[PDB]
Amino acid sequence: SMNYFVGNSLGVNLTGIEKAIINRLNLFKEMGRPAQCVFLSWNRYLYRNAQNYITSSDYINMYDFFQEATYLERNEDWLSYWTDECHYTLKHVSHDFRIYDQERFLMYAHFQDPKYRILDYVNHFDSQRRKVKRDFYDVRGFLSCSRILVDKQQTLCEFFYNPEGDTKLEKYFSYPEVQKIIVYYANKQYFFNNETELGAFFIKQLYQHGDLFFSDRNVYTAPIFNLTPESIPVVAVLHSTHIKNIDALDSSPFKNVYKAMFENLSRYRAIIVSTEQQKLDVEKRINHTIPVVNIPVGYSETIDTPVQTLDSVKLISVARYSPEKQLHQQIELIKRLVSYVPKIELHMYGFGSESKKLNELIQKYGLENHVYLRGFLSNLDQEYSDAYLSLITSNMEGFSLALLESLAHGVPVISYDIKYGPNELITSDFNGYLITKNDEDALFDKVKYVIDHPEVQQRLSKGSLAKAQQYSKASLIKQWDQFVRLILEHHH
Amino acid sequence: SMNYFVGNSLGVNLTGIEKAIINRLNLFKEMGRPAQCVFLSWNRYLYRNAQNYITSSDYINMYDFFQEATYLERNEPFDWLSYWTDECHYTLKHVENSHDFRIYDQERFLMYAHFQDPKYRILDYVNHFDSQRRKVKRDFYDVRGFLSCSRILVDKQQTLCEFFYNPEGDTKLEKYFSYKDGKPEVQKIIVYYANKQYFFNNETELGAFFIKQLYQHGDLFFSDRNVYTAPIFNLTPESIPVVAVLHSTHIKNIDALDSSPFKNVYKAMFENLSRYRAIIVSTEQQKLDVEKRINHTIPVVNIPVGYSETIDTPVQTLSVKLISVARYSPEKQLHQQIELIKRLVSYVPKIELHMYGFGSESKKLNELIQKYGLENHVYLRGFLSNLDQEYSDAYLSLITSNMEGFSLALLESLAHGVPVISYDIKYGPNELITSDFNGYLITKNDEDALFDKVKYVIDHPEVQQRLSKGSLAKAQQYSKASLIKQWDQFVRLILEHHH
């Protein structure tokens, strides 16, 4: 029996949902439940993005599936084919080419690498130089889709191929949205009006009695699941706040990405959220129509670096440089503290729009020896060892993997008491303090208190380690194990 | 070594060129030289049209060739209807007054199917529709059973591109179209051949590629549909020998031998004469004209386009029955034959004129017959495929045309012993008529001389008998065996010179 985690794709830079899905996959393998990520969009680069995270046997993409290119890995010279075997002439432009048959312009080629061992696309031209067809190659090397062009380079139809070149899907467009999909599957032909219907057909082919689906990218996956039979069990996963305005719990509309789910609640066996605090809110809002269960979206890995080698007082913030994170407040906090703590430092690890504003605010206060915008760091392990405490000054949060990591490194945290995440991970006077939202005077008081009393910081450090031990991998595994078993048990 | 007779296709009703190519194939087969008809146009009925006349191994069609369907015959019958209902679970709604079906998946309209036969055994096409009932694709089926071509539509069912498949469904050719003067015109052709891709701008270049794939040293090509085949051969190397075959007068204006432009259909051949090893024409008379016109730059040879079978049927069982075997078209001037009977009936009222053929002029000829009171004397017999019983009591054939070509019909009536009086017009009458031997040649449009000569033969049955015997003897010069000998000698000499 398989557990399927249904998102949409994998970007160059993984998103929160994409990381959550791969993480949940790893957890399931570890505990001995089979699991696979399920992807939907056509993405001829998907194998390239999966590479550093997940193996090809750990995912099924919908187009791969019908193109008979699932579980397929990279193929092992185009320029030697076009010259030595085909006798064409190539005039470089980029990593591009014009392919001529003697004097005749035939094709425009585009590669990725300067080794020109990975073909991207090839445009075809008629006798009047009209672009008639574009051939799109998969990073694994096979020809994946040819697009037929009309009028002012408008998409008329597209043909999708298996690696041997057989046509497996056809799409027909009017102005450009799909009006028709043809699929060659199981030795016959299937017809669909749109990609949502194609999605539901895919889900029905995947399912065998006993499997469980999770709906993770709900703006795409809920409409698909809404067209599949109720005998196919699926759980909805919310990775963010469920309503547009968190202060109108009862009346706020559901977020657009969650509408199709919440408007068909009876289709879902349960809803998963990351925090008890969110579970209680969602339960109330939906009048307990279906179960809601809190399962953390990550766990505390075992520590492999030195911990709490203190000496400079190092404050840290691990947060995207975004408005909601209200990072200027921490710069203000440092402006106040530095007169009491001359060797204080604040390191802020993240990225986003607020970079310029924040850096200029540092220049304005002369705090360039005290506050550092560190940018994004892949590995933060070395940064926590001398970290005295973490700061959260956000107006809104989600379950923080970063917070769990720093708590695992013994770094206590002072945070505003906003939904969702801090209440889950912080018990005041245990592993840190929760501060009234936007109360910057109380923030200053607690931060200064922990700095003034290193024995308080040490004790809050021991609480941090204990808080992290509560969210261990094994505790997380056991929550998922019992959830899946109980969901399936009730379905059948 | 193979001889290839390159025409375009075969219709349900064979044209003169198509007949000439099949006749030539049968002579080469009897002779023992390998021969094959070569066809160019995409025609998914071609196997059906060919079945009455040649075998599958007797021809190579260009599209069949690249579709890996050359020499393929008819598949076992397939009941698409049971496939669509029992296996696919579709709903089939018959269209009344048709062999058609609308095909549904529940409430969703998917497909419109057209069958050739009312037994629904020959699927012809299936149209596909999108969610807005737009017709986006047409699947065209070969009569042999396989899906031959899918046509992609745009806008108001205009042809954008076409994909051609082998019988297993692999794409072997692609064609892209742009419109001109309201019609689709090829702008690009892609061909999957020899594990490669080949690119062309038009059907002439594809044809030229196809000729090059067929040729091996020793082979010989005949260009029979020169409006298409000469532009093809002009794109092939002079190492490939080709003979141009003319099937009609070579110039627009027969009365300006030296200076008339060539007919449009022959223009590409005559403008590249050095490409061709020889020209074949049907009559000695045309040979002399063409030789003179091209200043003997390449050999010109006359070989008749068909042959005569000796007749076992009753012959000349002689009412005075005049006959005309002629399409009802203005060039034949059949109204003059009405005028002849109008004059003649006074002198023998037992006369009859039977006119075998069809065409636009039939109304006008009926009017004249009624006008002259000739309804019991002149008959428009329509088309008759077999004429053999009609020849047995025929006194005399008439030709009043202002232009002609070599006539297999006249050859057949001479084999049945029917003598002939004809205007002396090019081409054909001088080939098949020797004055006072099997008939008479009359100055063109001299109706009075026509009257006098016809009356003379009616008045002298012993002359009719003499001319009838000359007709038998004349026809026997065009025997199967004489034609074979001509073809054998020609091919021998052409190959020797080329090599």
Residue numbers in the entry:
A (entry chain B): 0 to 75, 78 to 94, 97 to 178, 183 to 318, 321 to 501
B (entry chain A): 0 to 317, 321 to 501
Publication passage describing the model:
Despite the biological significance of these two glycosyltransferases involved in pathogenicity and avoidance of the host innate immune response, their structures and the molecular basis of their activity have not been investigated. This study reports the crystal structures of SdgB and SdgA from S. aureus as well as multiple structures of SdgB in complex with its substrates (for example UDP, N-acetylglucosamine or SDR peptides), products (glycosylated SDR peptides) or phosphate ions. SdgB undergoes dynamic changes in its structure such as a transition from an open to a closed conformation upon ligand binding and takes diverse forms, both as a homodimer and as a heterodimer with SdgA. We found that SdgB and SdgA have a unique inserted domain, which is used to form a homodimer or heterodimer of SdgB and SdgA.
Two glycosyltransferases (GTases), SdgB and SdgA, are responsible for the glycosylation of S. aureus SDR proteins such as ClfA and ClfB. SdgB first appends N-acetyl­glucosamine (GlcNAc) moieties onto serine residues (O-glycosylation) within the SDR domain using uridine diphos­phate N-acetylglucosamine (UDP-GlcNAc) as a donor substrate. The subsequent addition of GlcNAc to the glycoproteins is catalyzed by the second enzyme, SdgA, yielding glycosylated SDR proteins in which each SD repeat is decorated with GlcNAc disaccharide moieties. The glycosylation of SDR proteins mediated by SdgA and SdgB protects SDR proteins from degradation by host proteases, thereby circumventing innate immune attack.
